[PDB]
Design a protein around this ligand. Structure first.
Ligand code: MG
Ligand code: MG
Length: 180
RNA sequence: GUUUGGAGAGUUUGAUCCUGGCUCAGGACGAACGCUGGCGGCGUGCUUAACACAUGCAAGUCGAACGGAAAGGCCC
């Protein structure tokens, strides 16, 4: 099951000697809610065809979000095309505290608890791009440990190790219930 | 050491991105005004003229400091 959010529909227009030739653009976000998300921008003469092209471009651009539990690993600031988004991890229960465009990215990413603030341009297209830039700056503790050559207990905070442990237990629980 | 904690929307253009102001959704009050109005608990009430003030109260008490004797009391 893929969750699909249409963030914005924009009616654009070319000009010609005969008048204005209108077109539609759709910014579409597709994800599985398991830490995969893709962003697709589709444009066509009609709204449904624009959305459909957006869905396809999003699936072409699936990428993986490092998620410790139901939260991002560490605070990050992504900047793209004047868009600036700050992401901060939150404790369980906080919920998605995010603005409209960033909410669509993070919900489809399956982030359940996050604090997100937009600090630059309010243009939905560029806010989405900035949010993706931030999510690409997220690092896994496993990857930090390897890149540093140190063990995991040496590079990460004990409380993040703990939250890792419990999240692995719930993954095992779902595997037990699902294979039973 | 460390989680207990940040949401945005509209509006410059034929269309676009940016910059940038304006406006709105929240909360608060020693409040006022309009419509409406059942009860109780607990608070609270001149923000203006340190303007002017009828009337009654808001500082007395001690006979174990003292001479005394108007009111009571008791004794002729
Ligand atoms: Mg701005
Ligand atoms: Mg006064």
């Amino acid at each position: 099951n893929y969750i699909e959010r249409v963030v914005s529909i924009n009616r654009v227009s070319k000009v010609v000697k005969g008048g204005r030739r209108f077109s539609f653009t759709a910014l579409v976000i597709v994800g599985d809610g398991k830490g995969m998300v893709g962003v697709g921008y589709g444009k066509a003469k009609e709204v449904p065809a624009a959305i459909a092209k957006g869905v396809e471009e999003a699936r072409k651009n699936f990428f993986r979000v490092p998620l410790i539990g139901s939260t991002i690993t560490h605070p990050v600031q992504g900047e793209a095309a004047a868009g600036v988004v700050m992401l901060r991890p939150a404790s369980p229960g906080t919920g998605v505290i995010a603005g409209g465009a960033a909410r669509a990215v993070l919900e489809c990413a399956g982030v359940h608890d996050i604090l997100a603030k937009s600090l630059g341009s309010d243009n939905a297209i560029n806010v989405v791009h900035a949010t993706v830039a931030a999510l690409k700056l997220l690092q896994r503790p496993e990857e930090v440990a390897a890149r540093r050559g140190l063990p995991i207990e040496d590079v990460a905070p004990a409380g993040m190790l703990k939250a890792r442990r419990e999240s692995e237990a719930l993954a095992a629980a779902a595997a037990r219930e699902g294979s039973a």
